Scaffold this active site. Structure first.
Site, mmCIF file in Angstrom:
data_model
loop_
_atom_site.group_PDB
_atom_site.id
_atom_site.type_symbol
_atom_site.label_atom_id
_atom_site.label_comp_id
_atom_site.label_asym_id
_atom_site.label_seq_id
_atom_site.Cartn_x
_atom_site.Cartn_y
_atom_site.Cartn_z
ATOM 1 N N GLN A 148 0.839 -1.195 0.000
ATOM 2 C CA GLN A 148 0.000 0.000 0.000
ATOM 3 C C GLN A 148 0.871 1.239 0.000
ATOM 4 O O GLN A 148 0.524 2.238 -0.710
ATOM 5 C CB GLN A 148 -0.970 0.054 1.168
ATOM 6 C CG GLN A 148 -1.865 1.302 1.184
ATOM 7 C CD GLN A 148 -2.829 1.248 2.318
ATOM 8 O OE1 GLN A 148 -2.879 0.251 3.028
ATOM 9 N NE2 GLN A 148 -3.632 2.265 2.498
ATOM 10 N N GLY A 206 3.685 -6.076 5.506
ATOM 11 C CA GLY A 206 3.708 -7.479 5.146
ATOM 12 C C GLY A 206 3.762 -7.681 3.661
ATOM 13 O O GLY A 206 4.154 -8.745 3.229
ATOM 14 N N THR A 207 3.338 -6.681 2.889
ATOM 15 C CA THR A 207 3.323 -6.776 1.466
ATOM 16 C C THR A 207 4.485 -6.044 0.856
ATOM 17 O O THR A 207 5.220 -6.604 0.069
ATOM 18 C CB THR A 207 2.007 -6.203 0.890
ATOM 19 O OG1 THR A 207 0.893 -6.910 1.442
ATOM 20 C CG2 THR A 207 1.970 -6.380 -0.645
ATOM 21 N N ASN A 221 3.394 11.370 0.233
ATOM 22 C CA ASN A 221 3.621 10.778 -1.065
ATOM 23 C C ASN A 221 3.758 11.827 -2.139
ATOM 24 O O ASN A 221 3.574 11.506 -3.301
ATOM 25 C CB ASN A 221 2.438 9.847 -1.424
ATOM 26 C CG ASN A 221 2.241 8.752 -0.418
ATOM 27 O OD1 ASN A 221 3.212 8.222 0.124
ATOM 28 N ND2 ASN A 221 0.992 8.392 -0.165
ATOM 29 N N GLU A 250 24.480 4.624 -13.580
ATOM 30 C CA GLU A 250 25.312 5.827 -13.593
ATOM 31 C C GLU A 250 25.161 6.590 -12.300
ATOM 32 O O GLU A 250 26.029 7.363 -11.947
ATOM 33 C CB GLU A 250 24.934 6.646 -14.843
ATOM 34 C CG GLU A 250 25.805 7.833 -15.177
ATOM 35 C CD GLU A 250 25.586 8.322 -16.622
ATOM 36 O OE1 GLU A 250 24.741 7.741 -17.346
ATOM 37 O OE2 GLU A 250 26.273 9.279 -17.076
HETATM 38 N N1 GDP Z 1 5.012 7.558 2.559
HETATM 39 C C1 GDP Z 1 3.922 6.799 2.794
HETATM 40 N N2 GDP Z 1 4.020 5.784 3.710
HETATM 41 C C2 GDP Z 1 2.957 5.011 3.975
HETATM 42 C C3 GDP Z 1 1.700 5.277 3.272
HETATM 43 N N3 GDP Z 1 0.823 4.376 3.709
HETATM 44 C C4 GDP Z 1 1.492 3.582 4.582
HETATM 45 N N4 GDP Z 1 2.746 3.990 4.752
HETATM 46 C C5 GDP Z 1 3.716 3.326 5.630
HETATM 47 O O1 GDP Z 1 3.995 2.023 5.103
HETATM 48 C C6 GDP Z 1 4.246 1.080 6.145
HETATM 49 C C7 GDP Z 1 3.695 -0.292 5.846
HETATM 50 O O2 GDP Z 1 2.434 -0.278 5.228
HETATM 51 P P1 GDP Z 1 2.182 -1.318 3.953
HETATM 52 O O3 GDP Z 1 3.413 -1.967 3.384
HETATM 53 O O4 GDP Z 1 1.354 -0.503 2.971
HETATM 54 O O5 GDP Z 1 1.377 -2.613 4.531
HETATM 55 P P2 GDP Z 1 0.937 -3.856 3.620
HETATM 56 O O6 GDP Z 1 0.065 -3.300 2.510
HETATM 57 O O7 GDP Z 1 0.188 -4.730 4.638
HETATM 58 O O8 GDP Z 1 2.229 -4.483 3.178
HETATM 59 C C8 GDP Z 1 3.618 1.671 7.373
HETATM 60 O O9 GDP Z 1 4.611 1.743 8.436
HETATM 61 C C9 GDP Z 1 3.204 3.097 7.033
HETATM 62 O O10 GDP Z 1 3.815 4.040 7.929
HETATM 63 C C10 GDP Z 1 1.658 6.379 2.283
HETATM 64 O O11 GDP Z 1 0.618 6.635 1.662
HETATM 65 N N5 GDP Z 1 2.792 7.077 2.103
#
Ligand code: GDP
Ligand code: GDP
Ligand code: GDP
Ligand code: GDP
Lengths: 433, 238, 410, 410, 433
Positions: free
Chosen positions: E11, E144-145, E228, E256
């Site tokens: 995500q 986790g992803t 983001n 590079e």
């Molecule tokens: N920069 C940024 N970080 C994010 C955002 N959403 C989630 N995170 C961070 O991503 C980390 C893991 O979330 P994620 O990998 O999406 O979970 P998964 O989808 O279960 O693998 C968390 O610690 C959040 O702080 C986003 O929109 N922007």
């Protein structure tokens, strides 16, 4: 649009038509107790197939093209109490004495008296029509009025006009028990007319209409309020092609229906069936798709007839879909299986006249109506031909038919003319085998 | 999208409809059972036997809750579970459940019923597999008498029990009694042509007579039987 | 070079809702008829902005045009270019040809004649109907007579829709084809036979949505347009309507054409569009293939299709095709181009194919006629409305000749 | 990702009246089931408009659903998604698990199986009951066995309601917990233990009105929804049901979660919602605090909660919290968000907290079991209905292990 | 031109890439909601570095070289609702169950299921590339992803190709509060991959990205729409040398970029910074010159990382200018002061890889991007190594990692492999001192 008159003869035909114009008016968004529509807005669908503009204010009543004829006063006075200012009360003709299981009172008697008054109101309707292309006479083939005057009226209407279809939507005698003691008489006297001077006689049977409301509409005692709604929903189903000009509505006129369903002039007794027979208790997740309604169309206990349809030969078939369809090629391909499953008659290569109407039913969203011109419909009339003969070897009841003006020579003709009818499917069964 | 998945969807809707119907009207249990039998069949075909078992247990619980007890219905439900166990390969449980069916019928009126004679036949067959010959013979004879009294001697069901006894006697090498049984089955099966009996059952009788005559040392009549079975199996191609 | 159009029957008028919503898109007009290319072909220039089409919406059962001239398209068609009359040619040829046909045919012709005296280069008739019903096939059979009797030196292209081989859709429908396919064979210079079984399948592979007869007709309405878009979007190899008779109709009977469309803004790289155009499953008829060799195929490739590719593509396609023995090695396939694709597409293709397989459509409609006529199986609806069995068996003896005329053309 | 729901017992079905009146509000549906967001999670799409929920209203004493399916909500639930049977699992585990449980469990499973074969992405079970009675705790203990034996790879979340520490509310109630908390510990992947003493108090501070078990369940019905609203109102930090087992359940026994809700259209500025979410008095259990350190807290903040604030709020909260020694300094608290608040609120919060204090709930229910079991104090109602003292002391020896498993987790 | 794939895992990686392809398409003058450019005119810059020609009509859509992978459906369905026909929806792969802070679902689980489908779309992209010279995997190192499948995918991609840079533009766990409870686990399990099989892992930290939008972009609550976009404007800044062939554009490929920024194979965790962090409210008279952007590049609260950059040793630095420059000798002479101010590592005499791109940013006219390979990036991972050990002395959560297929022997390797990572800067700090 093709106007169409619904003449309502007898108690059994009126009480269908009491419930038929309840449906059709509710189907067009018209109040069935006043005749007026919702104020200012037009009725949905094409109203002018069955109705007439009474008052040009766009909120006035729409008089249906319907004459209700019965020799007993209590039937139409029930309708006048339960229609308000809907019908034209010059068309709601009644008498005092009634007929009472006597064909020769409705045909040659008290029905002969009303015939100058009834035909002076069909002439009022037809001249009021744009160009009328069908007359749906609702009666029974059991009584003295519906089978008596219905035999009189139809022979008094094709004799007068002749360039118009007469679909006699009629109710056969139930074979489980006879509601009239002279009921196998009165059918055969009407099978003179409904074979010769009617373009088609859509049958209904009170035994099958009990089973299709008990086993299918899951109630204990199906009253005649619900027999005249199984018939109605079928009569408001075969006439949805006549009344609706929608998206891809296959606009089937009566002549357009009977050219597909009357193969030669003595094979026009049509059965009917309806799908889905889901009860009105909102069985939403059990609503039937088009692949399985057609599986429920053609069950032996699914037609509105005493006979077993798949035990004999479907000669001409007309499956009238009516409602919201998503699936046109899944349509007609279920019938492709049904071209193989069902007993058809080569003598005809293919016969499935398929109506679509996008305007859905009141009770159902995806509703299907069948009109199978079956060879089994002689097997209903084989019972009536046999129950006539047991009541003619004895020379049953009495003078009751004979004192009114009929003769023993005439009655033997009409038995033969019903024997000519029953053999006319027996000609068409083994030649169609 | 598969044909079996389609049959399941249809059978499930039909079961769900009968379930709702029995919610609105708790008395309509018989119809629920019928719809369940079709869906349970399909679950067996796909190997989900626990689902099939659950369906029949549900049918059973509804039958058990009737205010007027219907022992005939319970008998039938137990026999459907018994047959399920049999197809599952749980042979002891199949015998146990047919026996339960029979006990319910014995305690009420239903000793001489259609269901009971069927159950005794099917139970006898399980006893054959359990290698309990005497118990198998007993039940087959009872099924035989009941079908005799219910249908004529001239019926498909009588000939079927004759056949089943024949195979039982043949398998325990009582050749004489095997012969009598299969001939009685042959006699009946010849006289019954229409859709009240398929011709493949007639071919089985000749096949079985063949093995019996061969065991009897009448190799002539044996081949004559094996021939007539081949003629039949060939003649159903058309 | 200004093609009149006739839309008879519920099947034809429902194509007219599809065709004149695609003719307005390809010419780039709004739905009202005004300007949002040779626009003179389909459209009569009434005023500086508004272009009224050269269509008669001839119809019985006047609810089809009530869909057309009710919702969004009432301002488009001229109401002196129509006919609406009840009753409805009751799926009965004798109603459409004789009973309710002779009521309207004086009005049909005098509306055609009021639309072709505004022309200034009349060439053709894209007469659109079915051979199935009673209005499209009955009155469609009557217009073809009266139009050829009035204009015997103008090409009359019939865009039929054959009854389905799948099931009927009308009981008396194999009667209504042979009573119509007679008069198409006698009057029309070339017919395009289309089939709702193939129109279901090809639209089923087109859309991710189960089709309806509005979605089926957009396959037709492109084929109706693509035939006559080398006539109005000129490009190179200008193929007029006179070249669909000289090139594609070898014998004086074999003029029933099986037309495909491809691609089925959609771009296609075009070595595969020619493989999509002459796909056997993309032809819009249930023609025979295992016992079928072509006579004369066509290929109208419109849009961004440059002519160098057909020396490599279409010469490869014609080796893959099966022609008659009396057609040459690389020849037998005419071609054409337009300089403008249909709106929504970027490079289209059409293929009018005259083929012996269309006799299997004819052989079906005779084998259905064979049982059904000898047993009087719906015949009395014709007999009691003007048309005798002598007039109907004579209709068979031409189509049985016509079904033989392709078997003589192998 | 479509979560089935089971509502067993009078306690669970009364939450189902609260939950499926809050699930219809958050998805924005009317009470009949039709449309007034991932609606596929809770609701089975039967038709285009009507959404039947994925709930079994499994129940003995069939008067609870007579309240549900009598008044205003009969059209909503499917009646092939129910069971109603007399007698009523007579506040007696052995009636609910064995006597009147085995009568319905073939119907329960074949209604679950008719609801999960309509799925197309089954993930979880929000099985809602109490551990107090005989239907919610007896048949709730039986469903958890049969559902794990049928679906051993799907997360089964039990939303229990613990017996009150305040008084009994049922005599044999500490028996019915330990007979159920065994089977929750053996089968369910994570349980939310709720307490009617805390549900009285927090609702007493919520409303200016003395609560009832409809008003108490709206605290539960939000917690039942807020757990699975990062699964259906996605937002950022998508927390599915698989992450309430991996994140919040450290050891294979410690899966009994204490969930709060905040705020208790209501807006909250959110430096104080995190102080309201992790208030010790806002947690919905009488857990221990003076001898209690957490294991793993969660924080599902839904609605208009932007993620920048938790770097200042939640890092401040986790310093105020008490974790075990084997949890890191700023870690140990998972988070999540939804992009849609519950209807009536504008920014909500949830906190599944796995804590050693929930062993004090267990230690209470063993100290009540300790006196009551050794003196046979209601035991013969189990013995004379299937369940022996061997089967009941073995239920204690797991919960006495479980009450030690949190004391081993400090 | 050097094509470059942006794989978007998790995500957190997708919601960057949801906003990253918003930027890049707007940067090339392409509609970010249709994929089509302005009608008839070519896209500005060199589109084919990230994009692909779909339809040869010069007005059709340009599909970006981007596969979006996440095991939860709601993230990409948010992108499909907010991209239209821009992406190739065969690349927008989604599942149902999700991972949920479990490394061993994205790595060995539901992410193992998508791996034959994900790699069958990278092979679709790479074969469609002219000659691909970098893969920018966007994920997080927390979940986790993104941390699970991102560890799987990168080890499934260098294992397959190997002659291609993998710049894992990744988002570290914020140390202020953990957004996942198993977040110091999931990093260390990804620090196996992002150390061993990724050529560089560009970090980002959600604490610093809050401070650089609160104190610098002067808003109260910085949402993840603006986290983001700070990341995006940096990821659309390091890739401006890849996508633009302008006036004097120093065209820096990923290889590079990483030859200048990965000193030896275990020192490739790069921080980043952006200048100017002027808010978008048109502070035109407060727009920063090049002498003072570099003063704002190297603040302690200016990098996108939890660590304090000037409190440790800048090992390799790459200052990527991007925009309209008037002053080339005033450029690089501000860095001459920054060669003296900043803690550098002899162990390297000089390291400032300086990109110019004349094509300006969307939000900024004179924009600067930093990539400092810092020794402090072990101090971010010292926190993660410590928060792992507090959750391993207890042997934290449960069986959740262990039941999926991992072992306690494996987990102690990956802690050591992250200890080998943290010491690898501790080797390079005191030797670089
Ligand atoms: N920069 C940024 N970080 C994010 C955002 N959403 C989630 N995170 C961070 O991503 C980390 C893991 O979330 P994620 O990998 O999406 O979970 P998964 O989808 O279960 O693998 C968390 O610690 C959040 O702080 C986003 O929109 N922007
Ligand atoms: N479907 C239907 N049939 C009816 C109804 N009432 C009577 N019938 C049937 O109609 C047949 C004749 O009754 P009817 O013609 O009304 O007698 P008449 O009024 O004396 O001519 C009887 O056999 C009844 O079974 C009704 O309401 N609905
Ligand atoms: N392609 C196409 N076929 C249609 C359409 N509507 C009906 N048909 C078919 O056309 C055949 C003839 O019906 P039709 O000629 O409309 O009846 P008529 O207008 O009363 O003569 C039927 O068999 C239908 O299957 C349509 O809109 N498109
Ligand atoms: N939260 C909540 N608790 C309830 C409700 N109704 C009853 N309870 C409590 O739940 C406990 C168990 O009762 P219950 O399980 O309903 O009995 P059963 O259904 O016969 O098994 C009792 O101790 C009650 O205090 C309710 O609606 N909400």
């Amino acid at each position: 649009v093709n106007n169409t008159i619904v003449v309502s003869i007898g108690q059994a035909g009126n009480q269908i038509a009491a419930s038929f114009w309840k449906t059709v008016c509710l189907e067009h968004g018209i109040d069935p107790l006043t005749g007026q529509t919702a104020p200012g807005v037009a009725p949905r669908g094409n109203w002018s197939s069955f109705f007439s503009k009474l008052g040009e204010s766009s909120s006035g009543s729409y008089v249906p093209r319907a004459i209700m004829v019965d020799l007993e006063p209590s039937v139409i006075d029930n309708v006048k109490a339960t229609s308000g200012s809907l019908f034209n009360p010059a068309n709601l003709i009644s008498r005092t004495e009634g007929a009472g299981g006597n064909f020769a009172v409705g045909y040659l008697g008290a029905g002969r008296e009303v015939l100058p008054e009834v035909m002076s109101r069909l002439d009022y309707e037809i001249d009021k029509c744009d160009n009328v292309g069908g007359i749906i006479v609702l009666h029974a083939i059991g009584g003295g009025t519906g089978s008596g005057f219905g035999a009189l009226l139809i022979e008094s209407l094709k004799e007068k006009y002749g360039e118009i279809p007469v679909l006699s939507c009629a109710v056969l005698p139930s074979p489980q028990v006879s509601s009239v003691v002279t009921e196998p008489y009165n059918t055969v006297f009407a099978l003179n007319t409904l074979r010769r001077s009617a373009d088609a006689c859509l049958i209904f049977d009170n035994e099958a209409l009990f089973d299709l409301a008990h086993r299918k509409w899951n109630i204990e005692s199906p009253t005649v309020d619900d027999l005249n709604l199984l018939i109605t929903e079928a009569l408001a189903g075969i006439t949805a092609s006549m009344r609706f000009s929608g998206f891809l509505t296959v606009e089937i006129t009566l002549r357009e229906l009977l050219t597909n369903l009357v193969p030669q002039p003595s094979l026009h007794f049509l059965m009917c069936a309806f799908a889905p027979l889901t009860p009105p208790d909102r069985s939403k997740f059990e609503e039937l798709g088009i692949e399985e309604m057609i599986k429920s169309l053609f069950d032996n206990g699914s037609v509105f007839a005493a006979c077993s349809p798949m035990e004999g030969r479907f000669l001409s078939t007309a499956v009238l879909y009516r409602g919201i369809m998503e699936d046109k090629p899944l349509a007609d391909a279920a019938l492709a299986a049904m071209r193989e499953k069902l007993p058809l008659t080569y003598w005809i290569p293919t016969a499935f006249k398929i109506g679509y109407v996008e305007q859905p039913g009141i009770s159902h969203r995806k509703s299907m109506v069948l009109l199978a011109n079956n060879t089994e419909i002689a097997r209903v009339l084989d019972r009536i031909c046999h129950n006539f003969d047991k009541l003619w070897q004895r020379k049953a009841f009495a003078n009751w038919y004979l004192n009114e003006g009929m003769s023993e020579e005439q009655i033997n003709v009409l038995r033969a003319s019903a024997q000519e009818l029953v053999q006319s499917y027996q000609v068409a069964e083994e030649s169609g085998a | 999208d598969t044909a079996l998945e389609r049959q399941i969807a249809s059978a499930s809707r039909s079961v769900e409809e009968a379930r709702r119907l029995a919610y609105h009207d708790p008395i309509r249990v018989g119809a629920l059972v019928e719809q369940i039998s079709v869906l349970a069949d399909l679950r067996q075909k796909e190997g989900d036997f626990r689902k099939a078992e659950s369906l029949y247990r549900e049918a059973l619980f509804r039958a058990q809750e009737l205010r007027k007890q219907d022992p005939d219905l319970l008998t039938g439900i137990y026999s459907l579970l018994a047959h399920l166990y049999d197809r599952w390969g749980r042979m002891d449980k199949a015998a146990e459940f047919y026996e339960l069916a029979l006990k319910i019928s014995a305690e009420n009126g239903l000793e001489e019923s259609d269901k009971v004679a069927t159950i005794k036949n099917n139970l006898a067959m399980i006893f054959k597999q359990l290698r309990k010959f005497e118990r198998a013979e007993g039940y087959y004879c009872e099924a035989l008498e009941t079908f005799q009294r219910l249908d004529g001697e001239q019926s498909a069901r009588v000939a079927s029990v004759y056949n089943n006894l024949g195979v039982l006697y043949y398998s325990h090498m009582d050749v004489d009694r095997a012969q009598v049984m299969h001939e009685r089955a042959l006699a009946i099966r010849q006289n019954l042509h229409e859709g009240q009996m398929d011709p493949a059952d007639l071919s089985q009788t000749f096949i079985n007579l063949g093995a019996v005559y061969k065991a009897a040392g009448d190799f002539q009549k044996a081949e004559a039987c094996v021939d007539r079975a081949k003629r039949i199996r060939a003649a159903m191609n058309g | 070079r200004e093609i009149l159009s006739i839309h008879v029957g519920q099947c034809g008028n429902q194509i007219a809702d599809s065709f004149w919503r695609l003719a307005l898109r390809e010419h780039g007009l709004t739905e009202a008829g005004t300007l949002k290319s040779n626009m003179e072909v389909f459209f009569h220039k009434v005023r500086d902005g508004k272009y009224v089409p050269r269509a008669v919406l001839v119809d019985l059962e006047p609810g089809v045009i009530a869909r057309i001239e009710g919702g969004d398209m009432s301002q488009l068609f001229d109401e002196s270019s129509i006919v609406r009359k009840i009753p409805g040619a009751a799926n009965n040829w004798a109603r459409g040809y004789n009973v309710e046909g002779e009521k309207v045919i004086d009005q049909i012709m005098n509306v055609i004649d009021s639309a072709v005296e505004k022309t200034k280069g009349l060439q053709g008739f894209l007469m659109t109907h079915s051979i199935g019903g009673g209005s499209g096939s009955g009155l469609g059979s009557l217009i073809l007579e009266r139009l050829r009797q009035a204009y015997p030196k103008k090409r009359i292209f019939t865009f039929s829709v054959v009854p389905s081989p799948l099931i009927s859709d009308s009981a008396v429908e194999p009667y209504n084809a042979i009573l119509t396919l007679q008069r198409i064979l006698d009057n029309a210079d070339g017919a395009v036979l289309l089939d709702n079984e193939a129109l279901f399948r090809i639209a089923k592979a087109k859309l991710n949505r189960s089709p309806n007869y509005m979605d089926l007709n957009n396959i037709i309405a492109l084929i109706v347009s693509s035939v006559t878009a080398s006539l109005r979007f000129p490009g190179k190899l200008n193929t007029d309507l006179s070249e669909f008779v000289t090139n594609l109709v070898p014998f004086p009977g074999n003029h029933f054409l099986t037309a495909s469309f491809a691609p089925m803004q959609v771009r296609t790289n075009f070595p595969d569009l020619a493989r999509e155009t002459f796909a056997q499953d993309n032809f819009t008829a249930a023609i025979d293939w295992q016992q079928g060799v072509y006579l004369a195929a066509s290929a109208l490739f419109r849009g961004d299709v440059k002519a160098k590719d057909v020396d490599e593509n279409m010469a490869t396609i014609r080796k893959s095709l099966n022609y008659a023995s009396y057609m040459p090695a690389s020849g037998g396939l005419k071609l054409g181009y337009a300089e403008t694709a249909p709106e929504g597409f970027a490079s289209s293709g059409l293929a009018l194919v005259n083929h012996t397989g269309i006799a299997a459509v004819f052989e079906r409609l005779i084998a259905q006629f064979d049982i059904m006529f000898d047993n009087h199986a719906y015949t009395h609806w014709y007999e009691n409305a003007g048309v005798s069995r002598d007039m109907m068996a004579k209709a068979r003896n031409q189509i049985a000749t016509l079904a033989q005329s392709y078997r003589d053309a192998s």
